C-alpha cells in the first residue's frame, strides 16, 4: 500500500517560492523511479520530473526548466523541491509517487497548491 | 540507551529512579513507564504499528 | 526567578466543580517533572496529580482517580486542572511545580480553594 505524506501547500502570491516535503517512510530502499506528478483541474495527469536514488540524475519536463529543481536525501529518505516563477495555471495538486521493486507509482494524497493573488 | 539488541529488560516501576525517591506511585519528578499503546487509526498516518 | 501564575481558586459549594489554570513563564520550555501538590491546614504537603510534558499522558493519585482531569498544551504553555464532585476534605491550597532538567524544584504561590456550603 505504501505511505506517502505531503505538506506545506496552500495559497501563494504569483511568482513565489515553496518548499514542500515528501517524507517516504521506508520504501524497500531500492528506489529507481522517484518522481513527482501533478493533476491540473480538468487536465489529465502528466509527468513532471524524476530523481534517481543511485545517482544525482534529475530529469525535468520542458515546462519546468530552470524554475524547478528537485533533490532527495539518502540519509533522511525524503524528497524536497523548490519552485520559482509561479504563474496562475500552476494552480493544481501535486503528488510524489514511490516507484520501486514491484512497488508501482506508490501513490499518496498530495497537497493542494494555490497560485493566485486573492 | 534504547536497550541493547539481546537485552531482555522487562523491568517496571521507574528506570533507575534517579535523584528522586519512589514517593508512593510516582512523586514529583517521576513517572511510570510501560504505557499502553492506545493508537488510533487516524492519529498519525505513519504513527501506528 | 521562574514565576508561576495561578488562577481559578475560590469558594465552591460541596460537590461542585471549578477550573484551575496554572501557567509557566517559559521555564526553558522543557521539563519532565511537574505535578500538583496541596497543603491542607495542619497537614504536610502531599501529592495530588501530575501531567507529563513529553506527551498527552495523565497521572493521578489513588484518591483522585477519574474525578480530577488534567490537560496541558504546548502553544499556550499552561495546564488546566478540572475538578468534579469536590469533598469538604479537599479544601486546601494547591501548588503547581516545574522541575527543570538537572535542577532543583520550582514552586509558585498557589491559590486557596475552599469547599464549604457557606
Oligomer: part of a larger assembly
**Count of DSSP helices of chain A?**
0
Structural class of chain A: mainly beta
Protein structure class of chain B: little secondary structure
Rounded to an integer in angstroms, the radius of gyration calculated over CA atoms of chain B is: 15 Å
Work out the number of β strands of chain A.
11
Gap between N and C termini of chain A, in Å?
37 Å
In one word, what is the shape of chain A? globular
**What does the largest sheet of chain B look like?**
none
Compute the gyration radius of chain A: what is it? 14 Å
Number of helices of chain B: 0
Helix content of chain A: under 10%
Q: What is the 3D form of chain B?
A: flat
Give the H and E element order of chain A. Answer: EEEEEEEEEEE
Largest interface: B-C, 12 and 14 residues
What fraction of residues of chain A sit in β-strands?
A: 35-45%
Q: What is the percentage of strand-forming residues of chain B?
A: under 5%
Total number of beta strands of chain B: 0
Strand order of the largest sheet of chain A: 2-11-10-4-5
Largest sheet of chain A: 5 strands, mixed
What is the CA-CA span between the terminal residues of chain B? 21 Å
Question: How are the SSEs placed, and which strands pair?
Answer:
The structure is cut from a larger assembly and holds 2 copies of chain A (118 residues) and 1 copy of chain B (49 residues).
Chain A: E1 4-7, E2 11-12, E3 19-24, E4 35-39, E5 46-47, E6 49-51, E7 58-60, E8 68-73, E9 78-83, E10 92-97, E11 111-115
Parallel strand pairs in A: 2-11
Antiparallel strand pairs in A: 1-3, 3-9, 4-5, 4-10, 6-7, 8-9, 10-11
Chain B: no helix or strand
Amino acid at each position: 500500500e505504501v505511505q506517502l505524506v505531503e505538506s506545506g501547500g496552500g495559497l501563494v502570491q504569483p511568482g513565489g517560492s515553496l518548499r514542500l516535503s515528501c517524507a517516504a517512510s521506508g520504501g524497500t530502499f531500492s528506489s529507481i523511479g522517484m518522481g513527482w506528478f501533478r493533476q491540473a483541474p480538468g487536465k489529465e495527469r502528466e509527468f513532471v520530473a524524476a530523481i534517481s536514488w543511485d545517482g544525482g540524475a534529475t530529469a525535468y519536463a520542458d515546462s519546468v526548466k530552470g524554475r524547478f529543481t528537485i533533490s532527495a536525501d539518502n540519509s533522511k529518505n525524503t524528497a524536497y523541491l523548490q519552485m520559482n516563477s509561479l504563474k496562475p495555471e500552476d494552480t493544481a495538486v501535486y503528488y510524489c509517487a514511490k516507484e520501486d521493486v514491484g512497488k508501482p507509482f506508490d501513490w499518496g494524497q498530495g497537497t493542494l497548491v494555490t497560485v493566485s493573488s486573492g | 540507551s534504547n536497550l541493547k539488541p539481546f537485552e531482555r529488560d522487562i523491568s517496571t516501576e521507574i528506570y533507575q529512579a534517579g535523584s528522586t525517591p519512589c514517593n508512593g506511585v510516582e512523586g514529583f519528578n517521576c513517572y511510570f513507564p510501560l504505557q499502553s499503546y492506545g493508537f488510533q487509526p487516524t492519529n498519525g498516518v505513519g504513527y501506528q504499528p
